[PDB]
Amino acid sequence: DKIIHLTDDSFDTDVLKADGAILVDFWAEWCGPCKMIAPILDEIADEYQGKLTVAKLNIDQNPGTAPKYGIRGIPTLLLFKNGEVAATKVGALSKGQLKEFLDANLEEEKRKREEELLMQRSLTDPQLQAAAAAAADFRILPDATVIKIGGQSVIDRGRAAVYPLVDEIVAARKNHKLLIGTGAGTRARHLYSIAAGLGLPAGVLAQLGSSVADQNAAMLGQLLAKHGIPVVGGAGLSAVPLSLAEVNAVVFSGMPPYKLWMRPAAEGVIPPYRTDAGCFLLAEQFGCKQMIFVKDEDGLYTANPKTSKDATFIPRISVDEMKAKGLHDSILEFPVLDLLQSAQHVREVQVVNGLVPGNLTRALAGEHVGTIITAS
């Protein structure tokens, strides 16, 4: 066994001068509740190898030590931390109740060994990965909401689409904290076609698309400048906190910063992660309230309604239900649904028709209009 049998003399070097947490049993052969905890105690000795050291002191053989700590009960378990009594547990306990006590006192010790594991073991190790998932979850901007203003679906249309949405934005801004992200559109489709024509990789295409999303953010942010709403970037988003606090809204470019480090698609050079993914992950990172995609259709249909005489509208669908229906062309990029399932903060998205007045304002107030795509 790992249990140390102590003596009145041995207590100075085995308990006081010994490093690490020690649990000492003040027991006696006559004591009934001792005879009960004794098997439970040498069992936890193995179950707590290297975490805690178990010690036993029979009072009948060693009667000096007990009155020094005011032991007026049997059994009494004392948890020693660097020659000082940290916690006491008088009486008999069940198997579970003992662990419950030990753990509630050895939390700082468990934290220190978990920290040590996060610095010695590989990041690929499953035990390290599992201990990390168990950490606290902080939402940076929880009362904030992320909105995507479609490139081809709205900004490429111009005045008729944009001007009303600006009016909805400047007003909604008074009640909700908005992070307005932009799409790219046909100028990006053209670059992609030219670049693809040359056989340039997705990393290169990703940089081209990023610029169109920057132009759209600059144009959208100009109509909002009189209202104090700014355009943000710099790959650090240093200006976002002050702007959200004071003016309640920002305009950012929906493109991910991946550039040449853009993960390619299964086949083809079109970047798989465009503005739907850039906007979603920014909502996911900050821990935002909701993620709204403002497009040119009521939401998701069975097929593309621009190329379908009659398609059935889907008001509520899950990603598994979407994948199982096998969508030929989706309202959102296929990898966004794979990111939605993996998401920690944004466990559902909403698609709305920004060409219809009030749709944004109504969706913002929480009312379900259009398609809600849920993670599970």
Binding site: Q129, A135, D137, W261, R263, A265, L281, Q285
Partner: protein, 243 residues
């Protein structure tokens, strides 16, 4: 898809190798020095142990994955400034992510080698699911090496290569060396690896790079050998079919 810089040799130096200090770094700097008149190198550097400390503080604060990735990436950036300083007399400098992405051809026409961070600039846009950033040093090196259509990627570790179990772990006796592997085979098997699980995922979608050799930087000559296609460590097949 065209190979942008087909004459490029991408070499990733492990963060834990940097962490070893002068004992590992000084010989490696001499090996690297002697390599400059042979290859046109892009030397990308990993994060190591400091990234773990930024993770232990960051997670204790409850910070998300997208907060931790820039933080981790910063550490790789610092090992890079260290390595580049040792090679400064050879006209080598650390260059930032925007310069790697856009002006690498000029910088490599100017000098024989440049140092950069291995980690990709995913910043806030890092993928969720795990509280630990998935796209790390090995992943960032490969995405960039394959993007440029380079001649190759060589991972410089503090181990001989990939093993069946951690060779510096508790079950080190039951660990055996793997001279060759597939990205698919490693992805299927679960447990620890000297490389990111994300690297194997990105290797499935690779376009040009066929093999990635994992070599021991604590053994002088290994890196020199690997760069010449000599099998001196673990070769990882990506699943990019040749002609």
């Amino acid at each position: 898809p065209i190979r942008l810089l087909p004459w490029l040799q991408v070499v990733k130096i492990g963060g834990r190798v940097m962490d070893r200090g002068a004992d590992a770094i000084l010989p490696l700097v001499e090996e690297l020095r002697k390599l400059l008149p042979e290859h046109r190198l892009l030397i990308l550097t990993g994060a190591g142990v400091r990234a773990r400390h930024v993770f232990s503080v960051g997670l204790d604060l409850g910070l998300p994955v997208g907060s931790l990735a820039p933080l981790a990436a910063s550490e790789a950036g610092q090992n890079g400034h260290i390595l580049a300083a040792m090679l400064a007399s050879e006209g080598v400098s650390y260059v930032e992510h925007p310069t790697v992405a856009d002006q690498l051809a000029i910088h490599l026409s100017a000098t024989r080698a440049v140092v950069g961070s291995a980690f990709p600039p995913y910043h806030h846009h890092e993928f969720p699911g795990s509280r630990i950033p998935p796209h790390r040093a090995d992943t960032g090196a490969f995405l960039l090496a394959d993007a440029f259509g380079a001649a190759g990627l060589t991972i410089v570790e503090n181990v001989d290569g990939i093993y069946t179990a951690d060779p510096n772990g508790p079950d080190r006796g039951q660990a055996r060396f793997l001279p060759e592997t597939s990205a698919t085979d490693l992805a299927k098997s679960e447990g620890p690896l000297p490389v990111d699980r994300a690297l194997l995922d990105v290797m499935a979608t690779a376009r040009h790079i066929e093999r990635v050799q994992v070599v021991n930087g604590l053994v002088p000559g290994r890196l020199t050998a690997a760069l010449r296609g000599e099998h001196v460590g673990t070769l990882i097949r990506t699943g990019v079919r040749p002609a």
